[PDB]
Design a protein around this ligand. Structure first.
Ligand SMILES: CCCCCCCCCO[C@@H]1O[C@H](CO)[C@@H](O)[C@H](O)[C@H]1O
Ligand SMILES: CCCCCCCCCO[C@@H]1O[C@H](CO)[C@@H](O)[C@H](O)[C@H]1O
Ligand SMILES: CCCCCCCCCO[C@@H]1O[C@H](CO)[C@@H](O)[C@H](O)[C@H]1O
Ligand SMILES: CCCCCCCCCO[C@@H]1O[C@H](CO)[C@@H](O)[C@H](O)[C@H]1O
Ligand SMILES: CCCCCCCCCO[C@@H]1O[C@H](CO)[C@@H](O)[C@H](O)[C@H]1O
Ligand SMILES: O=C(O)CCc1ccc(Br)cc1
Ligand SMILES: O=C(O)CCc1ccc(Br)cc1
Ligand SMILES: O=C(O)CCc1ccc(Br)cc1
Ligand SMILES: O=C(O)CCc1ccc(Br)cc1
Ligand SMILES: O=C(O)CCc1ccc(Br)cc1
Lengths: 310, 310, 310, 310, 310
């Protein structure tokens, strides 16, 4: 019949989440408990009941004994996995206890930036068996898997963590076991508030103050630079993310500021054209719409994206 | 006679395409099925019909048995190939089943940016046999090769994928086998629309609004900065790409905006010179050409590149 | 009974502290003294009393003799540990003397930027025993552990260093030994003085000089750009640090400059509106509040953060 | 007498040339043919006439047979050399055929930027024998060495390629063999035309158009910003290159634009000072020199560097 | 008694000096000549008098023969040392000749930027013996150590090179041998002249030309932006260097330009205030101090730092 292989995986550190590259990096420990009766050994009185091996001399021992080990792969792994510890402890019984401490980057293919920066994402690690379920069946090692207390991440905040077993058909026709460690994390909005919301709101508010000067030309020059500032901010936000084929809530907000600013230019050009054509008195009356449009326009726009996305 | 070696290659992830360096990076699995009758082994009843080996003790076994393995190379490979799994399963028969899970950057020499960002490119992986076709003939392993479901790429979108066998003469006089996994991908234009087309169009449109002010000096100062903005945008686009010896559709568009902006300065200088020489009334009549040239000039220019490239 | 394992750890160099990534990197030496009576050897007269081994042939010797070594891990390690020396010197007695020279990045999870740049941080290295205290008990090797004379760091300045032993339960039910090398460091404020305090103070002071011109429009244009400069400075500071979910003393200072500058615009708009509405004489009298507010506002704000944080 | 060792080296890819770091990187294959009569073997009928080995078990075989191999070094190598293939094929004869596929960065010490961007450089690879010419004499393997068809470089264009043998005295008193693969490459000027020549020429030309406005103050403000733009461009060019102790043709061009721009400011200050001192009519007559100096100054300057450098 | 171990170290390339990180990187060769009479071997007539080994099988041979090797460490090493060659040639005598070709980054703790860019620095490599002087005494291998002819560095220029032996107490109570290869290098000032001195001098000079316009407001606006430019230049210089706790000659120069520019604003505000208060004729007389202060102020400041630092 098939031998049960117990998989445990604990993430100790989140060394970073790279959203631009849709990957994350962690320091973690993998724990395997697999009982192979052929590995059983007799000991003379006094000598150890538990043999401890390096991985290299353990695999070599398996090859001599013609024993197949539950060869596994981190399916969503990326690049190099720098190992710290790869140790085996073998009991009289045949109970092999394996520990693998590593640092690695993993694929984050579940990334959805539609609501960025208000988004919540799913990150996971797939531990696949190369051999099919008729030889080795993966089971959940009980008191081990999950995320630590000192992960070191400052922007993301883990909302929930889960482990579950399933199947894959990567190398074989028959189903093969897959252990999954999943977690969900959401953003600490402070960065976004401090670096984007407050500067953008400041530019808008202090620019509106200048309307009380009743200089239409001065408004035009101001809305002109404001438009460039928003174009600049637009590039800075573009930097954090991949070259997505879809519109972000952030993109919508930025395109929104462009449109209002464009109309601010357009409108004040008209008011200055009235002034120029000897209808200065009229420009002055209409100016009340000009002054009160500006705040309403941005507030209307803000409710529009909020409805349009939530 | 020559032994058939079955090659399979599956790309699981596109970790990135670096167009500036004309290379791409992938996580993939290589699968080899090669029957060597000399590798055949006898087993006593009950014992394994399938011996499983690490790559190191398998090659050492070949060297003892004085057996030549189908030594292969990833011809278009770049730098380090970080391996995850290099495992061998040997049957009584001599059927060696090899699996190689790796992460690697590969050369993308097929890169043609003439129509960028509207371009479609070809990416491939060459798996060459070091030994000639009289010793080892490469065959396509049937249900394996291709690209996965979760590649993780956000800008490129795979239009088609193919596998085919051919020959090379890299190390030998005689022809040697080459397995090829090719794919074509094209861009998600959203990034370009959001970061380049809309900002450039905004600068142009809102700058045109100001013509209704009938201040020629103000137009000159505006077209002056606009020219610098386009020069800046020109550098930002230069960043994404190599220092090509050829003109991009993007380069054409940018050079086009320079020329129109240059003439906008030139023209408005003339209109302001008429005004200055007591012919203000004339500048005012001609101004209608000045106002309507601007939109037509850019629309004429836009049809010109489109014809000139498509 | 359990065997005492003596741990010594000396940091020779601080290759860098990366605050944006909340990690630090060091070149160091680990020293272990562990007496295993089973390792004892007899020598014929004249031959060595001290056998010297590479780590690889020492571990292989342990595996033959079926001896369990005090397998240890650098708990807060990050990525690769580039080794220089991994040497063993074994006495007739069984006294194994191990030396491990390495370069490594470590996690700095103790990072608190609330008072940045006036902050003091704690950095440490955890050396855990994989095996529980009933088998191996970690002890402090006496004349070795600590930090060197040539660490090479220029901004941080080590205020204090300590070593202490404790316990962890990482792999086992029972307590396992943990050796800790801690140090505290604080910043050399010069960089911050030269690049941030002096430029910001200059912008403010020379901008205030211009108030003696009695041009309200000119003040408005100046406070407008000043606001953008501070927004720029705000991004430059954002660069050095993680995307924290909390307010830095530095953030407070920057938000403070925004508010005063915003009011500088607001106020001068009012004074210019009085001038515009034929009350130029009144604007002139009030102007004395306008001139003296500016210095007081910034000095009041400076005492406010100082109280609010200290 | 000394044994002839045949060296072949083929560069398959130029992964990049880093001029700022004066190094280049390539994917290449090294081929060695060396006949050692002591390596000769007898085979029983039917068994292989050609033994194939991994490098590791081949060197171990040499050490048993007490055979010295022609130990070689890539003299101008830099950092890590990521190997793909290191394979040996040994004939009944003793003919050892070695293949080494690698990716590596090499030193480019021949770099002369005096005529940049119009420069032509020399790049090479030195393959030195550790042992002197009395033991091993390097010979050129005939149908192999050189550069490929798909190098992947876009800016450089290989003008010529050569191989030659010489001597070095690196480790020994006596001469030791050195195999050299050299190539010369020159630049595709398009990047420079598109990003530097056209933007600089545009700034100059459209700035000259404004002279027809006959506003001296406006010219001064324009030449002021133009000077800053050129200072900016100067830093952008500084980026591509090392901190050379010599003047580049590019440096000369940039310093040239500074001087003319400085005089443009200087001159127009004088013309505006005449206007200011009631000699407006005189400023107007001299203005024709002012208008025609500008184009001549830059064209005169362009012939001056061309003569001064070619 | 103790065995003499001859150390030779030749730096072939300076791959770079990173002043921001206070480290340097080199390609070099280490040469060791150590005579161990126990390593002596007998050969039958005709067979080799010199056995050649890989490092791995040489160390394994030492471990069998129970011979202690002079284990050494590059004390100031940083990260990974990418080896090219690690070869041993053993004579009948016992004369072991070791060669170690490597690429490595080393600590530069001797870095003093007080006179930057006019500074001269000391760079070195420490080769320590792990074992004390009673076992192994380090001696200088005669015709080998030093720096090469093609180092590839462009900014630094090696003023002098030295080798000397001393002692350390890193791992032991007793003194242990240390071989030292030191060199001093100074800067090629061209980069600094071209990118910093000439642009700063240009800004100052062409800004002074504008004083001949007798527009105080225009001077104020100019000195305002000039101050920002210097603040920008200040950040660009900050980039090249660490976050030092001390004042650089460069810092002094920059702070100097700030002060003069600040006073230029201050002064011209006063002159414009006289003009504003109907004392235009007085502003005009004082203006001669205003015009001649500017050049003297900067020349006075330049002699002040020169005295203050030299
Ligand atoms: C910009 C936000 C601050 C607004 C406060 C009003 C005073 C003017 C600030 O300088 C402004 O900066 C813009 C951006 O570049 C320019 O387009 C504009 O012409 C210029 O007047
Ligand atoms: C710039 C696109 C927005 C146009 C809207 C009209 C109002 C003015 C906006 O500021 C302008 O910015 C240019 C770019 O730097 C400067 O050259 C120019 O002198 C300045 O007036
Ligand atoms: C800026 C600090 C120096 C103040 C000295 C007064 C002279 C003017 C300096 O240039 C100013 O720069 C600001 C920042 O961008 C712009 O908003 C403003 O319109 C412009 O006049
Ligand atoms: C700059 C090249 C374009 C010239 C066309 C004339 C219109 C003005 C363009 O804006 C100018 O930009 C300069 C560079 O920053 C500033 O110094 C200058 O005061 C400003 O007027
Ligand atoms: C700047 C060095 C060149 C001086 C030559 C005099 C002409 C004006 C150049 O443009 C100036 O650029 C400054 C820097 O941003 C601005 O503060 C200032 O308002 C603006 O007038
Ligand atoms: O091939 C390798 O490197 C590791 C594989 C491995 C498989 C099963 C156990 Br239990 C332990 C290790
Ligand atoms: O030399 C190597 O590292 C790998 C080569 C290899 C060749 C054939 C088979 Br089947 C498996 C492996
Ligand atoms: O497994 C390893 O790489 C190193 C472990 C080790 C454990 C105890 C001593 Br004493 C020395 C070394
Ligand atoms: O020492 C090494 O790694 C490689 C050296 C080498 C020398 C001669 C032949 Br032929 C093949 C290889
Ligand atoms: O432990 C190592 O890797 C290298 C050490 C070494 C010591 C002495 C000689 Br001679 C040669 C080599």
């Amino acid at each position: 019949e098939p031998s049960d292989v117990f998989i445990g995986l604990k993430i100790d550190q989140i060394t970073g989440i790279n959203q631009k590259e849709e990957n994350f990096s962690v320091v973690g420990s993998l724990r395997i408990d697999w009982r192979q009766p052929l590995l059983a050994f007799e000991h003379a009185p006094g000598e150890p009941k538990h043999r401890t091996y390096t991985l290299a001399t353990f695999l070599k021992l398996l090859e001599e004994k013609q024993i197949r080990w539950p060869a596994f792969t981190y399916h969503n792994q990326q690049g190099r996995m720098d190992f710290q510890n790869r140790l085996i402890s073998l009991s009289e019984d045949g109970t092999v206890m394996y520990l693998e401490r590593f640092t690695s980057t993993f694929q984050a293919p579940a990334f959805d930036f539609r609501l960025f920066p208000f988004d919540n994402q799913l990150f996971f690690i797939h531990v696949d068996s190369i051999f099919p379920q008729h030889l080795f069946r993966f089971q959940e090692m009980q008191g081990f898997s999950g995320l630590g207390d000192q992960l070191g991440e400052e922007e993301w905040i883990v909302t929930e963590v889960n482990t579950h077993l399933t199947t894959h058909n990567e190398f074989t026709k028959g189903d093969a076991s897959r252990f999954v460690l999943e977690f969900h994390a959401e953003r600490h909005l402070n960065y976004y508030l401090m670096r984007i919301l407050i500067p953008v709101l400041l530019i808008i508010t202090v620019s509106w103050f200048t309307f009380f000067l009743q200089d239409y030309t001065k408004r035009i020059d101001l809305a002109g630079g404001n438009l460039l500032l928003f174009i600049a901010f637009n590039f800075t936000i573009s930097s954090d993310l991949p070259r997505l084929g879809y519109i972000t809530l952030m993109d919508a907000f930025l395109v929104g500021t462009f449109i209002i600013t464009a109309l601010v230019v357009l409108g004040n050009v008209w008011l200055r054209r009235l002034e120029n054509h000897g209808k200065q008195a009229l420009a002055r009356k209409l100016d009340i719409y000009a002054i009160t449009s500006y705040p309403l326009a941005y507030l209307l726009g803000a409710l529009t994206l909020w409805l349009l996305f939530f």
